[PDB]
Structures are given as structure tokens and as C-alpha cells.
Design an enzyme around this catalytic site. Structure first.
Site, short mmCIF file in Angstrom:
data_model
loop_
_atom_site.label_atom_id
_atom_site.label_comp_id
_atom_site.label_asym_id
_atom_site.label_seq_id
_atom_site.Cartn_x
_atom_site.Cartn_y
_atom_site.Cartn_z
N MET A 17 50.29 34.69 131.13
CA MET A 17 51.04 35.90 131.41
C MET A 17 51.54 36.55 130.13
O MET A 17 51.84 37.75 130.11
CB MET A 17 52.21 35.60 132.36
CG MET A 17 51.78 35.30 133.80
SD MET A 17 51.01 36.83 134.73
CE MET A 17 52.65 37.75 135.16
N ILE B 183 46.75 30.91 136.41
CA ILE B 183 47.48 31.50 135.29
C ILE B 183 48.89 30.92 135.14
O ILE B 183 49.54 30.58 136.13
CB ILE B 183 47.56 33.05 135.46
CG1 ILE B 183 48.03 33.69 134.16
CG2 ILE B 183 48.47 33.42 136.62
CD1 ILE B 183 47.94 35.20 134.17
N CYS B 184 49.33 30.77 133.90
CA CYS B 184 50.65 30.24 133.60
C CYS B 184 51.25 31.13 132.52
O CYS B 184 50.78 32.25 132.31
CB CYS B 184 50.55 28.79 133.10
SG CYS B 184 49.67 28.58 131.54
N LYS B 185 52.29 30.66 131.84
CA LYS B 185 52.92 31.46 130.80
C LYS B 185 52.03 31.66 129.57
O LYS B 185 51.83 32.79 129.13
CB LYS B 185 54.24 30.82 130.36
CG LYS B 185 54.86 31.46 129.12
CD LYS B 185 55.97 30.59 128.55
CE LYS B 185 56.41 31.07 127.17
NZ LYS B 185 57.33 30.10 126.52
N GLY C 146 48.68 29.77 128.95
CA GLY C 146 47.26 29.45 129.01
C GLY C 146 46.86 27.99 128.89
O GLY C 146 45.77 27.60 129.32
#
Ligand code: NA
Length: 100
Positions: free
Chosen positions: A90, A62-64, A66
Site C-alpha cells: 500500500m 497486499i500489505c503495507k 510488500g
């Protein structure tokens, strides 16, 4: 590439065992809160941290937003690691129930 939604990821909390989550955002971003149990390894450092990944397990990335996480998933899979992208990042997971 494999992927799951944030809604699907949250429901995973209700399963027997906790899943492996890797947060690839930068330090100041994770400083605002992470998903309980997540391991933080910045995207830029992923190539030097392949030894962290157990080949017999699967990791949800997961990142900010996608997109970057999807890049990491492709990279991991091309290096023999089982990875799944968390769509939306996120941003979509939200700011509720995070570890500060
Ligand atoms: Na870390």
C-alpha cells in the site's frame, strides 16, 4: 512465487471483471483506507481463514510494504491456493482513491 506491480494492479480495474484482493494489514491500518472491493483478513489470522479462499480462483495479496504479503502468498500456495503478491504494498499503491 508470482507477483505484479501496483501499476499493473491498477490497470486491472480496466479489465472485464474485478480481481480478488486480500488486504492483510492490521485493523487500524485498514481504517485509514482500503482498495475498493478488497477483503480484509489480517496476516496473523490467515491460517484460520483458509476456507475463505476458492480453489478455482486467484487472489492478489497486499500489505503495507510488500514483504509480509509475499510471505502470505507462499503460505497460501503451499496450502493449495492461487495467490499473487502485489509488489511494494500500500506504500506504493498510494493514498488516492481509497474507500474510507
Ligand atoms: Na475483515
Amino acid at each position: 512465487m508470482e507477483s505484479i506491480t501496483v501499476t499493473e494492479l491498477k490497470e486491472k480495474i480496466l479489465d472485464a471483471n474485478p480481481v480478488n484482493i486480500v488486504d492483510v494489514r492490521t485493523d487500524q491500518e485498514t481504517a485509514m483506507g482500503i482498495i475498493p472491493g478488497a477483503e480484509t483478513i489480517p496476516m496473523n489470522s490467515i491460517p484460520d481463514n483458509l476456507n475463505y479462499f476458492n480453489d478455482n480462483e486467484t487472489y492478489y495479496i497486499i500489505c503495507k510494504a510488500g514483504g509480509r504479503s509475499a510471505q502470505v502468498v507462499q503460505y497460501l500456495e503451499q496450502n493449495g491456493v492461487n495467490a499473487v503478491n502485489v509488489e511494494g504494498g500500500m506504500d506504493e499503491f498510494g493514498d488516492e482513491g481509497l474507500e474510507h
